[PDB]
Amino acid sequence: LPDSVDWREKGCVTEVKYQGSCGACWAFSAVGALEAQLKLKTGKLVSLSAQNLVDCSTEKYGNKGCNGGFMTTAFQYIIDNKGIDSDASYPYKAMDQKCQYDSKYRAATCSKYTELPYGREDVLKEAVANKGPVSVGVDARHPSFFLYRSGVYYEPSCTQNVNHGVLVVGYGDLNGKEYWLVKNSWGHNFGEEGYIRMARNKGNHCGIASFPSYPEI
Ligand SMILES: *C(#N)[C]([C]O[C]C1=[C][C]=[C][C]=[C]1)[N]C(=O)[C]([C][C]([C])[C])[N]C(=O)N1[C][C]O[C][C]1
Numbered sequence: 001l002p003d004s005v006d007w008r009e010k011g012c013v014t015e016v017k018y019q020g021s022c023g024a025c026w027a028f029s030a031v032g033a034l035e036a037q038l039k040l041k042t043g044k045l046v047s048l049s050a051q052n053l054v055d056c057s058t059e060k061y062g063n064k065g066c067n068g069g070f071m072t073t074a075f076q077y078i079i080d081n082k083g084i085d086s087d088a089s090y091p092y093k094a095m096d097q098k099c100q101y102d103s104k105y106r107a108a109t110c111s112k113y114t115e116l117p118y119g120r121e122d123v124l125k126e127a128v129a130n131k132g133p134v135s136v137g138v139d140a141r142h143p144s145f146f147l148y149r150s151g152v153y154y155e156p157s158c159t160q161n162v163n164h165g166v167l168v169v170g171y172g173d174l175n176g177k178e179y180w181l182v183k184n185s186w187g188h189n190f191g192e193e194g195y196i197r198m199a200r201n202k203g204n205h206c207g208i209a210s211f212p213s214y215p216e217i
Contacts, residue, residue, distance in 0.1 A: 001125055001126060001129045001130075002129055003172070003173070004170070004171060004172030004173065005128055005129050005170045005171055005172070006169065006170035006172070006181060007036055007128075007132065007133050007169040007170055008169060008170070011039060011045055012035070012036035012039045012040065012045065012132065012133065012169075013032070013035070013036065013045075013133065013169050013183060014032070014035050014045060014046075014047045015047070015188075016183065016184070016185070016187065016188050016193070016194030016195070017047070017050065017092065017185045017187075018185070018186065018187035018188075019050075019092075019094065019185045019186065020094035021066075021094060022054070022065075022066035022094040022095055022096075023066050023067055023068050024050055024053075024054050024065070024066060024069070024092075024094070024185070025164050025165040025166065025184075025185055026053075026063070026068065026069035026070055026071050026074060026165035027050040027051075027053035027054050027057075027069060027074060028050045028165070028167075028185035029071045029135040029136070029165035029166055029167050029185070030050075030053060030071040030074035030075060030078075030135055030165075030215075031047070031048035031049065031050050031053065031084070031087070032133060032135070032167040032169075032183055032185075033071070033075075033132070033133050033134065033135045033167060033213075033214050033215055034048055034075070034078065034084070034108055034110060034215050034217075035047065035048055035108075036132040036133045036169075037108075037110075037132055037214075037215055037216060037217045038107070038108045038217065040132060041217045046086055046087075046088075046107050046108075047086070047087035047088070048084050048085075048086060048087055048107055048108055049084060049085045049086060049087045049089070049090040049091075049092075049107075050087065050092050050185075051087075051090050051091060051092045051093060051097070052084050052085045052090045052100075052101055053069070053074045053077065053078075053084070054066065054069075054092075054096060054097070055096065055097045055098065055099045055100060055101075056077060056081070056099035056100075056101050057069065057073060057074045057076075057077030057078075058099070060077075061073035061074070061076065061077050065096040066094070066095060066096050069165075070165075071135035071137075071165055071213055072113060072115060072135075072211075072213045075110055075113035075213065075215045076113070078108070078109070078110040078215070079109075079110045079111065079112065079113075081101065082103070082106075082109060083101075083103055083106035083107075083108065083109050084101075084106070084107065084108050084109075084110070085101060085102065085105040085106060085107060086105060086106075086107035089102075089105035089107070090102075090105060108217065109217060110215045110216070110217060111216060111217055112215070112216055113213055113214065113215040113216070114127075114131075114213060114214055114215075114216070115211070115212070115213045116134070116209070116212040116213065118209075118210060118211070119160070119204045119209050119210055120209055121200060121201055121204060121208075121209045123209075124136075124168070124180075124208075124209045124212050125171060125200075127212065127214060128168055128169075128170065128171055129171075131214055131216075132214060133167050133168060133169040133170075133183070133214070134167070134168045134212045134213065134214045135165065135166075135167055135168075135212065135213050135214060136162075136165070136166060136167070136168055136182075136208055136209070136210075136211065136212045136213075137162030137163070137164065137165055137166075137207060137210060137211045138162055138163075138164050138166055138182075138198065138206045138207055138208050139158050139159045139160065139161055139162050139163060139164070139206045139207050140163060140164035140166075140206070141163050141164075142155050142157055142158060145196075145206075148190075148191045148196050149191060149192075150191065150192055151174060151197065152174050152177040152178075152179045152197050152198070152199055153179075153196055153197060153198045153199060154199040154202065154205065155205075155206065158205055158206035158207075159206070159207065160204055160206075160207035160210050161207065162206075162207040162210050162211060166182050166183065166184050166185070166196075167182065167183040168180050168181065168182055168183075168208070168212070169181050169182070169183045169195075171200055172197075173200075174197065177199070178199070178200040178201050178202075179197035179198055179199060179200050180197070180198045180199075180200045180208055181195060181197055182195060182196045182197070182198055182208075183195055184196055
């Protein structure tokens with residue numbers, strides 16, 4: 001496997017989004033992963049509708065819109081629904097709404113998704129290198145995460161109890177300090193212009209490899 005990977009260099013990552021006061025991190029993580037597969041399949045980079053997931057991948061998928069959800073069940077909704085609309089056609093409003101999905105605005109489909117084995121950072125590395133960005137849950141419930149500005153994030157009090165959905169779009173090292181390159185959905189003012197480099201091969205730091213999954217088309 002390559003020592004470092006950055007899917008942004010491969011044109012498979014869209015602009016960083018701002019979820020606002022709506023807890024739709026799970027929806028942003030899911031569309032983010034599917035956006036890369038869509039680019040790999042069609043050659044086009046298009047932001048997909050996180051709102052579509054918030055409003056439609058609801059109770060039947062164990063999700064609660066702005067109150068939380070799962071990337072895996074979000075992928076299953078897209079599969080069952082036979083599509084997800086473009087973000088342009090179904091914009092994000094940072095609030096729960098009645099489902100407004102319309103197949104006339106479909107921008108992607110999904111045929112399946114894969115959940116990686118719990119806590120295996122080596123397996124996660126292989127997936128990021130060979131398949132594409134991977135949706136993951138992390139424990140972001142610590143002040144240091146909110147205050148992160150730059151460098152490799154390491155929090156001694158981090159746990160494997162995850163609560164925030166994000167997207168691993170690469171991996172590498174900062175002068176030896178290995179990290180996972182993570183796209184967040186807290187806007188471009190968060191961390192490294194929307195990204196955070198989280199400690200890699202540090203005993204499943206913040207549970208980054210606890211629940212990884214990626215979709216395919
Ligand atoms: C996102 N956004 C939400 C809310 O995140 C809370 C938070 C905020 C700041 C720092 C740390 C955490 N999270 C979720 O949607 C998570 C994602 C999952 C992969 C861990 N899911 C969630 O909270 N659920 C609770 C309700 O049932 C569905 C899942």
